[PDB]
Amino acid sequence: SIKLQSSDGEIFEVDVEIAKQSVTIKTMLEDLGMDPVPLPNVNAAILKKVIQWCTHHPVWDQEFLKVDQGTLFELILAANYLDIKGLLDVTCKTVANMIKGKTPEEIRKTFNIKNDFTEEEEAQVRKEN
Amino acid sequence: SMLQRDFITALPARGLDHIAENILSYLDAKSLCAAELVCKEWYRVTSDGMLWKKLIERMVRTDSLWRGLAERRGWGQYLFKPPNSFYRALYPKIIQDIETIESNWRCGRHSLQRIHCRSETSKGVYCLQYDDQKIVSGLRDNTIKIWDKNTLECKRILTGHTGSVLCLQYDERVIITGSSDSTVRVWDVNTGEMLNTLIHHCEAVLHLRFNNGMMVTCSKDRSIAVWDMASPTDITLRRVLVGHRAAVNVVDFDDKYIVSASGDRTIKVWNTSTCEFVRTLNGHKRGIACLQYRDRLVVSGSSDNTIRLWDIECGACLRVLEGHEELVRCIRFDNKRIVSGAYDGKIKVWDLVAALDPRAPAGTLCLRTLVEHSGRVFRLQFDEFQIVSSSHDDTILIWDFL
Amino acid sequence: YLDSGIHSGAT
Ligand SMILES: O=C(Nc1cccc(-c2nnn[nH]2)c1)c1ccc(C(F)(F)F)[nH]c1=O
Numbered sequence: 308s309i310k311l312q313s314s315d316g317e318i319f320e321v322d323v324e325i326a327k328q329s330v331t332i333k334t335m336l337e338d339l340g341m342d343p344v345p346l347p348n349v350n351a352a353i354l355k356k357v358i359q360w361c362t363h364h365p366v367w368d369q370e371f372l373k374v375d376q377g378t379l380f381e382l383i384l385a386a387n388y389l390d391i392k393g394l395l396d397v398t399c400k401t402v403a404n405m406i407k408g409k410t411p412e413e414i415r416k417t418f419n420i421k422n423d424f425t426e427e428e429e430a431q432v433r434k435e436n
Numbered sequence: 437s438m439l440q441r442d443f444i445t446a447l448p449a450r451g452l453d454h455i456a457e458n459i460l461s462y463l464d465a466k467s468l469c470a471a472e473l474v475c476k477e478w479y480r481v482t483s484d485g486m487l488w489k490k491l492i493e494r495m496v497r498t499d500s501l502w503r504g505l506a507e508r509r510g511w512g513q514y515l516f517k518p519p520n521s522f523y524r525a526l527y528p529k530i531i532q533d534i535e536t537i538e539s540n541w542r543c544g545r546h547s548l549q550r551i552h553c554r555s556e557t558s559k560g561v562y563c564l565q566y567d568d569q570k571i572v573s574g575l576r577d578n579t580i581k582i583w584d585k586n587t588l589e590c591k592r593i594l595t596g597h598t599g600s601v602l603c604l605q606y607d608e609r610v611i612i613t614g615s616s617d618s619t620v621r622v623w624d625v626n627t628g629e630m631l632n633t634l635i636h637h638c639e640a641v642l643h644l645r646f647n648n649g650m651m652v653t654c655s656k657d658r659s660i661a662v663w664d665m666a667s668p669t670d671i672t673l674r675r676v677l678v679g680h681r682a683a684v685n686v687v688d689f690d691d692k693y694i695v696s697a698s699g700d701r702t703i704k705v706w707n708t709s710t711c712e713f714v715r716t717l718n719g720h721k722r723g724i725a726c727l728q729y730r731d732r733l734v735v736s737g738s739s740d741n742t743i744r745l746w747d748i749e750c751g752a753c754l755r756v757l758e759g760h761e762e763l764v765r766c767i768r769f770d771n772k773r774i775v776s777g778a779y780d781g782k783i784k785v786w787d788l789v790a791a792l793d794p795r796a797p798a799g800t801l802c803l804r805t806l807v808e809h810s811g812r813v814f815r816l817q818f819d820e821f822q823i824v825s826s827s828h829d830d831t832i833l834i835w836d837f838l
Numbered sequence: 839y840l841d842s843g844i845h846s847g848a849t
Binding site for chain 2: 374375376377378379380381383384387395399400402403404406407408409410411414415417418419420421422423424428429432433435436
């Protein structure tokens with residue numbers, strides 16, 4: 308087992324083979340020999356969610372990703388920082404599924420986005436479709 | 437935790453532009469257009485990210501039709517290392533192009549080139565394979581003729597067989613041929629040099645396939661031979677499969693199964709690894725003349741004038757295709773169509789998706805009948821853009837729907 | 839008659 312240290316300070320015991328699915332955590336282990344591994348960019352709440360995903364590794368992922376967009380955004384960032392390609396892939400595909408098959412207005416409404424085109428600019432981009 | 441979050445704005449704001457581009461790269465065309473109109477920053481991300489270029493490249497990577505047009509039309513020159521808007525304006529032109537190609541297939545609109553093989557004595561072309569550079573063809577006059585795909589001229593005559601060349605396949609290194617003289621021969625695909633001859637079968641070698649170190653051959657002598665090819669000059673017999681009660685007219689295989697079909701009216705399935713019999717596909721009322729196998733799909737053509745589709749795992753016949761007026765002598769399929777040729781010189785185009793949907797009525801299944809041969813159609817190969825077929829009439833036809 | 843490429847169950 309290897310101790311992972313979240314930005315808060317809470318220490319988590321994780322099996323080395325789960326931890327080492329992240330190339331980032333593997334490099335800190337294998338090349339710099341750090342124990343524990345401080346992780347200043349991932350707090351405890353998101354870290355527990357990622358560790359949960361790593362142990363299990365989709366229908367399970369869809370249920371795991373039934374969270375607010377703020378948490379999904381934090382999950383994308385943690386997966387990027389830790390370089391867990393599988394989770395970054397599952398989070399990005401989830402965001403793309405929230406975009407596809409919708410009008411611009413439903414996308415705006417989905418994500419709380421203000422339309423900031425000028426009238427002139429919108430007519431031009433629309434003509435080019 | 438925030439309730440909502442503009443992923444596509446927030447990620448670049450944080451110096452993570454590539455993640456935002458990757459999210460958007462999963463969109464289909466129409467959703468990518470929608471994303472463009474979400475807001476100014478979304479538009480900038482799609483434009484600076486070259487997403488339309490990235491979208492066309494993903495299609496070319498995943499669809500041989502898109503790959504074929506990229507090469508044939510030349511816009512492929514701009515792909516894989518002209519601004520983003522160029523790719524945005526190109527995308528609909530490609531869509532319309534696909535539509536016109538699909539219409540030409542559905543309506544039978546094509547141009548035709550005809551090679552007269554000019555066989556001096558025994559007329560007819562039993563077999564063929566082609567690429568963008570060449571057509572390699574096997575002839576009843578005992579030769580292999582290699583034709584230039586572009587100029588239609590004869591570039592090489594390969595002699596050595598003492599009877600008709602009934603079957604052939606080639607790859608990047610070799611041509612392998614089977615003959616009425618009961619031998620299999622191996623030729624250098626570049627120089628034509630005869631490299632090996634296999635003496636095994638007691639009667640005409642009617643079909644063969646090989647790929648990635650193994651070959652299957654089958655014979656009028658009612659047997660199948662399984663070969664290991666360590667090299668063009670080191671080919672060893674691994675096993676002989678027997679169980680068919682008449683000539684084995686065709687064989688196909690992949691990593692799961694070997695599939696053979698016979699005058700004995702049956703298709704037999706064998707485990708490629710073990711060479712053990714697995715199952716018999718029954719159902720045709722007469723001998724089977726032709727077959728193709730890929731994935732889970734077996735397609736067979738028979739003397740009973742029908743085509744049958746089969747799933748390989750359970751052996752069920754999924755569909756009987758009626759319409760040919762004579763023996764179905766060759767058949768191929770891809771992801772969209774079946775193409776079959778018959779003893780009356782006619783070629784039929786079938787909608788394979790429709791055929792695999794048991795709701796579709798039979799009369800809607802044959803899209804077109806193509807009538808340009810004056811003798812039995814012995815072999816054909818096709819792709820998204822064309823059919824190449826050959827006949828007892830001593831001609832090779834290229835039917836071009838682009 | 840048939841072409842040399844294929845054969846039936848005859849003998
Ligand atoms: O002419 C054929 N057959 C046939 C004819 C008359 C009766 C019966 C019969 N007798 N009893 N029940 N049916 C059968 C024939 C030709 C080619 C092929 C093949 F090359 F594709 F393999 N196969 C065939 O079968």
